[PDB]
Swiss-Prot record:
Substrates-to-products reaction catalysed: 5-amino-1-(5-phospho-D-ribosyl)imidazole-4-carboxylate + L-aspartate + ATP = (2S)-2-[5-amino-1-(5-phospho-beta-D-ribosyl)imidazole-4-carboxamido]succinate + ADP + phosphate + 2 H(+)
Pathway annotation from the record: Purine metabolism; IMP biosynthesis via de novo pathway; 5-amino-1-(5-phospho-D-ribosyl)imidazole-4-carboxamide from 5-amino-1-(5-phospho-D-ribosyl)imidazole-4-carboxylate: step 1/2
GO cellular component: cytosol
Organism this protein belongs to: Ehrlichia chaffeensis (strain ATCC CRL-10679 / Arkansas)
Stored Pfam families: SAICAR_synt
Keywords of this entry: ATP-binding, Ligase, Nucleotide-binding, Purine biosynthesis
Domain of life: Bacteria
Family: Belongs to the SAICAR synthetase family.
InterPro entries per the UniProt record, alphabetical: SAICAR_synt/ADE2_N (IPR028923), SAICAR_synt_PurC (IPR033934), SAICAR_synth (IPR001636), SAICAR_synthetase (IPR050089), SAICAR_synthetase_CS (IPR018236)
EC number: 6.3.2.6
Name of the molecule in the record: Phosphoribosylaminoimidazole-succinocarboxamide synthase
Biological process, per Gene Ontology: 'de novo' IMP biosynthetic process; cobalamin biosynthetic process
GO molecular function: ATP binding; phosphoribosylaminoimidazolesuccinocarboxamide synthase activity
Length: 237
């Protein structure tokens, strides 16, 4: 029983109303769905990488939706209401940031840059200010300060763990949600943390390992995702 299907994942119900299955597909899309393809095994690797990184973040006290790894494509996660914001954290310039400020890809920032987007396909995920978020009551003042603190802490944790296996975390996107029926719920990290949601460059060569291999038609897409999995030791025995 499907509850939701997005561009790369399906959420399935379980017999427990408060737990759902996050199922990783092999679909990839880019440029507001102008470009789509099947990349065999991409979902398996994203499942393993995300479950791995969620657990690394849990180990440092980050609250997440992750419950358990079930199989090659699936993990058990908390059923939560997703806040309709994408938080993008940037360490170097890349993607549409580079393009709109005409700053070269790979330009390092003095401090990380957080940008917020309203998650909406129809509107192509428009950027929003803090005041917008607050006016529309998507978060309270306290939640918005918290989401930024958590995002930066997550950036530090992920940046370090990737650096230690020879990968630069260029930028990444987070989504958060809140527990059912709890108006005082803290912010739980949701969606995925994978090469679909993080720009990841090999430190020595600047080779891109992530979804940019698909976006920029660089070939060896699965090989990049597999390199990330291998270097992380994310694939179970
Ligand atoms: Cl971008
Ligand atoms: Cl950092």
């Amino acid at each position: 029983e499907k509850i939701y299907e997005g561009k790369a994942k399906i959420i399935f119900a379980t017999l427990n109303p408060l737990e759902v299955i996050q199922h990783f597909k092999d679909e990839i899309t880019a440029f507001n769905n102008k470009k789509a393809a099947i990349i065999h095994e991409k979902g398996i690797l994203n499942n393993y990488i995300s479950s791995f990184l969620m657990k690394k973040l849990i180990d440092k006290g980050i609250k997440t939706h992750f419950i358990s790894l079930l199989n090659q494509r699936e993990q058990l996660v908390k059923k939560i209401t997703i806040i309709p914001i994408e938080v993008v954290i940037r360490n170097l310039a890349a993607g549409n940031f580079s393009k709109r400020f005409q700053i070269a890809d790979g330009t390092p920032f003095k401090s990380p840059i957080i940008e917020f987007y309203y998650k909406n396909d129809e509107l192509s995920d428009p950027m929003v200010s803090e005041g917008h978020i607050l006016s529309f009551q998507w978060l309270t003042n306290q939640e918005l300060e918290k989401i930024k603190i958590l995002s930066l802490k997550i950036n530090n944790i992920l940046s370090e763990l990737f650096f230690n296996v020879g990968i630069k975390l260029v930028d990444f996107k987070l989504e958060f949600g809140k527990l059912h029926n709890d108006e005082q719920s803290d912010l739980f990290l949701a969606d995925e943390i994978s090469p679909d949601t993080c720009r990841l460059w090999d430190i020595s060569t600047n080779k891109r390992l992530d979804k940019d291999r698909y976006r920029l038609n660089l070939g060896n897409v699965i090989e990049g995702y597999r390199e990330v999995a291998h270097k992380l030791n994310a694939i179970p025995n």
